[PDB]
Amino acid sequence: GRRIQGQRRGRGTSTFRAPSHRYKADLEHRKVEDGDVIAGTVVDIEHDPARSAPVAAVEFEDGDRRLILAPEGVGVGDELQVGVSAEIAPGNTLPLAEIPEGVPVCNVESSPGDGGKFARASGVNAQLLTHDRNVAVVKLPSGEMKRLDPQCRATIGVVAGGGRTDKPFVKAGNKHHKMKARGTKWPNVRGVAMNAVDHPFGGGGRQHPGKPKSISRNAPPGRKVGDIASKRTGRGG
Amino acid sequence: PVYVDFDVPADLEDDALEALEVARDTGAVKKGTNETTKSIERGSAELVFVAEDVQPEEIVMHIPELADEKGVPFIFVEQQDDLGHAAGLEVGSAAAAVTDAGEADADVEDIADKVEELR
Amino acid sequence: ARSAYSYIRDAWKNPGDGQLAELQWQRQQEWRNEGAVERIERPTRLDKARSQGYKAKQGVIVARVSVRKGSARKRRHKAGRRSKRQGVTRITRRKDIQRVAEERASRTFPNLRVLNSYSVGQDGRQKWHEVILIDPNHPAIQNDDDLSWICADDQADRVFRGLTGAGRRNRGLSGKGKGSEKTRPSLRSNGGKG
Amino acid sequence: GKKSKATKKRLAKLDNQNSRVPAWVMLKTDRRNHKRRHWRRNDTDE
RNA sequence: CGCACGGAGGCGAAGAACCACAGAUUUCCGAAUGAGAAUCUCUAACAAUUGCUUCGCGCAAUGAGGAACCCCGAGAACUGAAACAUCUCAGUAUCGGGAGGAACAGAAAACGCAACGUGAUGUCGUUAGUAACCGCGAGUGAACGCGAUACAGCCCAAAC
RNA sequence: ACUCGUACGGUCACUGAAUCCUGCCCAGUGCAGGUAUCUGAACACCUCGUACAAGAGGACGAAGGACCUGUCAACGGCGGG
RNA sequence: GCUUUACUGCAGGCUGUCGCUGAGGACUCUCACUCCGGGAGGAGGACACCGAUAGCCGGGCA
Ligand SMILES: [Cl-]
Ligand SMILES: [Cl-]
Ligand SMILES: [Cl-]
Ligand SMILES: [K+]
Ligand SMILES: [Mg+2]
Ligand SMILES: [Mg+2]
Ligand SMILES: [Mg+2]
Ligand SMILES: [Mg+2]
Ligand SMILES: [Mg+2]
Ligand SMILES: [Mg+2]
Ligand SMILES: [Mg+2]
Ligand SMILES: [Mg+2]
Ligand SMILES: [Mg+2]
Ligand SMILES: [Mg+2]
Ligand SMILES: [Mg+2]
Ligand SMILES: [Mg+2]
Ligand SMILES: [Mg+2]
Ligand SMILES: [Mg+2]
Ligand SMILES: [Mg+2]
Ligand SMILES: [Mg+2]
Ligand SMILES: [Mg+2]
Ligand SMILES: [Mg+2]
Ligand code: NA
Ligand code: NA
Ligand code: NA
Ligand code: NA
Ligand code: NA
Ligand code: NA
Ligand code: NA
Ligand code: NA
Ligand code: NA
Ligand code: NA
Ligand code: NA
Ligand SMILES: [Sr+2]
Ligand SMILES: [Sr+2]
Ligand SMILES: [Sr+2]
Ligand SMILES: [Sr+2]
Ligand SMILES: [Sr+2]
Ligand SMILES: [Sr+2]
Ligand SMILES: [Sr+2]
Ligand SMILES: [Sr+2]
Ligand SMILES: [Sr+2]
Ligand SMILES: [Sr+2]
């Protein structure tokens, strides 16, 4: 047959790429040597095309102007601190070790110094639960208990733009505008609606996947479609 | 370094090189790793010098153990060019051997003894 | 008596034992951080180089080349083939890694000609070989009685035509009798059945 | 379109070639430009 | 005073034309090399990779071409087997790299008419569709030797 | 490539606005998890064999399978008497 | 051309084993190797990656 869509993606052609030339910046944490003597002022609030959420422009003491992964409640004029001795306040960044237990955090680093990997989307937040000298236990937005190095930096508060998912797109055209801002081919044609040559579910008079949808983890690309290694399906049970 | 098992003080090395210089003007010395090797093998060597900046180390690796099983005493020199100059060469020398000293027999003998104490 | 060289030789007979083992363990850390072709001032295996034709003269160059370890890196068939011509994983190339190394070196030094080469070890993912190259245009070599032969026109790009010792061995030209029916005088003239 | 200096030289040459065989050549050879081109009917290069 | 049988004019005994050999001139693009460009442009140039090095592009090398032949790599299918998969077509077509006027090979860790014998290597004739291979099917297929051609043997590494 | 992206994400699929709803079946097939015991290759190991080798057998046993379990908005099924 | 529990194979995934690979049937360490860090340094670690092979799945492909 012919390579299915999921395989066309891999090639990374224009159709499947994200509009990077239109993107603003990666909201990574500042790199401070030590001393914490790095504070700045929120100079402006901007819209981030890549995340459909507001982001804050900060002007630091040492003359650095950088965009920041902004939590809810950050406003122009406000002073932000980044470092070990940072004040425990919303919008401030400091290692998990310096953060008190039971405090909502966002833009959490996976490995100290990476700039932040977890809890970055609209309205989400990680919850700092347990402390230690060797490991900080954080509950991620998915509900997973994650063990992290206490030296991993994070921002206090939840990510701005919460509730975005609460309003329906209502019309195709609205979805359209959003997809243009992402690395995604849209709209979506069902496998069962294509010819047998184009997808494992294509062909046959009436539309129907002529086989069970739960596919093995070991299935090769081109065959791995439908319900990937499902532990179960449906709503019952 | 893989062949070096002890550090020789800069002062001992100075004396040793001076001893080597008067050994060539008076007695006889061997210049070059091959010639030095045969001396230790024929037993004609009284004191062998080995540079420490020899790359690759293969060239000299064998000297230390070969000298040990032949009773022949050895000493290290930090630089290859110095050993070569002391032997009276425009070029460097990875290893050298004072085959029968000359008007420095007492000095050479002391140097050997100073090394023994130094492991 | 034994030459000093015989000791370098004897050490290299068992690269995994003695001082050589520690030397290699140290060196490879540096080699892995080096490029594909690194010119070196002195051969790592002096005895082997001199034995192969090396001389501490002008126009003699030694370079260490690293090549990925293992079999062929082959692309699977687009069009239809019989099961016999479908395989992809176990198929290996007909040229050995040492030969690939010699060619990469000669390409880096276009004006020079490959004289010979030898192995200097390998790790789990790559192999290293040191190639001896000669400058056929330098008078110190045109006047050398033991090397001036490499200056001849027919010796140009000798490595690319399989004229190196590794080339000749790989072409099955070692044996003068039984087994060399399809190798001598050339693989091509014997219908490429060697 | 916009022609470069080089293109212009080429077009100019093509125009010059597009002439009739001189009359004196007819007499000399005792009896037709096989390359006569028309702007509309034919097509030049580039 | 070309092909080229016109007109006008001119050159040649100051030996022209014509021919051989040698030399001069030889625009731009082109490996194309100062940077760039559909044959042009812009502001001193071995661009790039190398060797030597007076460490300065100072001295040099490479690049690209050529009818096929040649050497080293990559390597089909149609086809045959009256299907077809091993096998066959075939190491063929085609691709990548490279040399020369020819390439390649070549002075035995050979041969093994087993010998008290031959004596580097190609190639030609033969050995022979033999030995060997093979859904032991279809098919594939040497060698030693012999008769010829031409003949030529040497250099390192190490010991000292 | 996705990705200047990080679960309010994005990947893979099915259905196809709203409204009222969406029953029964895990035997087969698929996916997933577990598994005392059974089965389960090669290397190394052990026995026989060979002055060696081919080879025969043994012990151990991964994933997998047997076996158990979960699962139908998973493939699908919901008859005759 | 297409399909599949047709025949025969090939990718690919999973899994064991050998090499890379080091020191003191369960373990500790650091020194290769890997990852984070501008750096110092931190995390991990003889595993993982990679080469080789073996068993299972394997119309994704011929
Ligand atoms: Cl969306
Ligand atoms: Cl060459
Ligand atoms: Cl004979
Ligand atoms: K065929
Ligand atoms: Mg960012
Ligand atoms: Mg778009
Ligand atoms: Mg759709
Ligand atoms: Mg249709
Ligand atoms: Mg299909
Ligand atoms: Mg349907
Ligand atoms: Mg006109
Ligand atoms: Mg130019
Ligand atoms: Mg047929
Ligand atoms: Mg065959
Ligand atoms: Mg020939
Ligand atoms: Mg038949
Ligand atoms: Mg054949
Ligand atoms: Mg024979
Ligand atoms: Mg429908
Ligand atoms: Mg519809
Ligand atoms: Mg990295
Ligand atoms: Mg098919
Ligand atoms: Na070259
Ligand atoms: Na026209
Ligand atoms: Na000319
Ligand atoms: Na040049
Ligand atoms: Na220069
Ligand atoms: Na037929
Ligand atoms: Na047929
Ligand atoms: Na067959
Ligand atoms: Na006879
Ligand atoms: Na069922
Ligand atoms: Na068709
Ligand atoms: Sr980032
Ligand atoms: Sr970064
Ligand atoms: Sr269908
Ligand atoms: Sr239900
Ligand atoms: Sr020197
Ligand atoms: Sr060339
Ligand atoms: Sr027209
Ligand atoms: Sr002869
Ligand atoms: Sr509805
Ligand atoms: Sr079931």
UniProtKB/Swiss-Prot annotation, chain A:
Q: Please indicate if the UniProt record lists RNA-binding as a keyword.
A: yes
Q: Which family does it belong to?
A: Belongs to the universal ribosomal protein uL2 family.
Tell me which Gene Ontology terms the entry assigns under biological process: cytoplasmic translation
Q: Which residues lie within the region annotated Disordered?
A: 199-237
GO molecular function (one): rRNA binding
Assembly, in brief, is: Part of the 50S ribosomal subunit. Forms a bridge to the 30S subunit in the 70S ribosome. Interacts weakly with protein L37Ae.
One Pfam assignment: Ribosomal_L2_C
What keywords are annotated for this sequence in UniProt? Answer: Ribonucleoprotein, Ribosomal protein, RNA-binding, rRNA-binding
Q: InterPro entries of this UniProt entry?
A: NA-bd_OB-fold, Rib_uL2_dom2, Ribosomal_uL2, Ribosomal_uL2_arc_euk, Ribosomal_uL2_C, Ribosomal_uL2_CS, Ribosomal_uL2_dom3, Ribosomal_uL2_RNA-bd_dom
Q: What mutagenesis or variant effect is reported for H199 to A/G?
A: No incorporation into translating E.coli polysomes; ribosomes assemble normally. Significantly reduced translational activity
- rRNA-binding in keyword set: yes
Show the PROSITE patterns listed in the entry: RIBOSOMAL_L2 (PS00467)
Species of provenance: Haloarcula marismortui (strain ATCC 43049 / DSM 3752 / JCM 8966 / VKM B-1809) (Halobacterium marismortui)
Name the chain's protein: Large ribosomal subunit protein uL2
Q: Which gene encodes it?
A: rpl2
Q: What else is known?
A: This protein can be partially incorporated into E.coli polysomes in vivo, indicating it can replace the endogenous protein.
One GO cellular component assignment for this chain's record is: cytosolic large ribosomal subunit
From Swiss-Prot, chain B:
Family matches, as InterPro entries: eL8/uL1-like (IPR050257), Ribosomal_eL30-like_sf (IPR029064), Ribosomal_eL8-like_CS (IPR004037), Ribosomal_eL8/eL30/eS12/Gad45 (IPR004038), Ribosomal_eL8/Nhp2 (IPR018492), Ribosomal_eL8_arc (IPR022481)
UniProt keyword Ribosomal protein present: yes
Molecular-function annotations in GO? ribonuclease P activity; rRNA binding; structural constituent of ribosome
Q: Where in the cell does this protein reside?
A: Cytoplasm
Listed under GO cellular component are: cytoplasm; ribonucleoprotein complex; ribosome
Chief subcellular location equals: cytoplasm
Keyword Ribonucleoprotein among UniProt keywords: yes
**UniProt entry keywords in alphabetical sequence:** Cytoplasm, Ribonucleoprotein, Ribosomal protein, RNA-binding, rRNA-binding, tRNA processing
GO biological-process terms attached to the record: ribosome biogenesis; translation; tRNA 5'-leader removal
List S-S links within the chain: none
**Which SUPFAM superfamilies does the record cross-reference, listed alphabetically?**
L30e-like
Q: Which family does it belong to?
A: Belongs to the eukaryotic ribosomal protein eL8 family.
Give the protein's function: Multifunctional RNA-binding protein that recognizes the K-turn motif in ribosomal RNA, the RNA component of RNase P, box H/ACA, box C/D and box C'/D' sRNAs.
Oligomeric state and partners?
Part of the 50S ribosomal subunit. Interacts with protein L15e. Probably part of the RNase P complex.
Protein name per Swiss-Prot or TrEMBL: Large ribosomal subunit protein eL8
Q: Source species, please?
A: Haloarcula marismortui (strain ATCC 43049 / DSM 3752 / JCM 8966 / VKM B-1809)
UniProtKB/Swiss-Prot annotation, chain C:
Superkingdom of origin organism: Archaea
SMART domains for this protein: Ribosomal_L15e (SM01384)
InterPro entries listed in its UniProt record: Rbsml_eL15_core_dom_sf, Ribosomal_eL15, Ribosomal_eL15_arc, Ribosomal_eL15_CS, Ribosomal_uL23/eL15/eS24_sf
One BP term from GO: cytoplasmic translation
PROSITE patterns linked to this entry: RIBOSOMAL_L15E
- Keyword set includes RNA-binding: yes
GO CC, one annotated term: cytosolic large ribosomal subunit
**Description of how the protein assembles with itself and partners:** Part of the 50S ribosomal subunit. Interacts with protein L7Ae and weakly with L44e.
Q: Which family does it belong to?
A: Belongs to the eukaryotic ribosomal protein eL15 family.
Name it: Large ribosomal subunit protein eL15
Write the gene name: rpl15e
Swiss-Prot record, chain D:
The record ties this protein, via SUPFAM superfamilies, to: Ribosomal protein L39e
List, alphabetically, the Pfam families matched: Ribosomal_L39 (PF00832)
Q: Which GO terms describe its cellular component?
A: ribonucleoprotein complex; ribosome
* Gene3D superfamilies given in the database record: Ribosomal protein L39e
Entry's transmembrane regions: none
Which biological process annotations from GO are given for this protein?
translation
Q: Which UniProt keywords apply?
A: Ribonucleoprotein, Ribosomal protein, RNA-binding, rRNA-binding
GO terms (molecular function) for this protein are: rRNA binding; structural constituent of ribosome
PROSITE patterns cross-referenced by the UniProt entry: RIBOSOMAL_L39E
Recorded family membership: Belongs to the eukaryotic ribosomal protein eL39 family.
Entry function: Binds to the 23S rRNA. Forms part of the polypeptide exit tunnel.
Q: How does it assemble?
A: Part of the 50S ribosomal subunit. Interacts weakly with protein L23.
Q: Which NCBIfam families match?
A: PRK01242.1
**Name by which UniProt lists this protein:** Large ribosomal subunit protein eL39
Query: Which organism does this record belong to?
Result: Haloarcula marismortui (strain ATCC 43049 / DSM 3752 / JCM 8966 / VKM B-1809) (Halobacterium marismortui)
